[PDB]
Amino acid sequence: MELKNSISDYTETEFKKIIEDIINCEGDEKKQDDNLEHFISVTEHPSGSDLIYYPEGNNDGSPEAVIKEIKEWRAANGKSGFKQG
Numbered sequence: 293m294e295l296k297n298s299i300s301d302y303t304e305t306e307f308k309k310i311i312e313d314i315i316n317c318e319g320d321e322k323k324q325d326d327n328l329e330h331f332i333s334v335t336e337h338p339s340g341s342d343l344i345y346y347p348e349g350n351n352d353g354s355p356e357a358v359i360k361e362i363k364e365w366r367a368a369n370g371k372s373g374f375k376q377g
Contacts, residue, residue: 308359311359
């Protein structure tokens with residue numbers, strides 16, 4: 293989706309509504325796919341959907357641990373996470 297063209301225009305909680313969008317499925321699979329491009333796009337986070345469909349043991353499998361790994365990946369990579377919340 294042609295949403296906020298970067299993570300630093302996201303906040304952690306706007307990204308939650310996208311990340312929750314999918315986990316719930318506010319949609320028809322296709323809506324998750326349309327997110328899932330976007331979830332690469334803003335993030336640069338190389339896994340994409342691997343944090344969502346193949347999650348590991350840091351992961352709570354909720355929208356929380358992905359937001360975390362997006363913060364934590366971006367900052368570990370030296371990059372901007374979302375907004376300063």
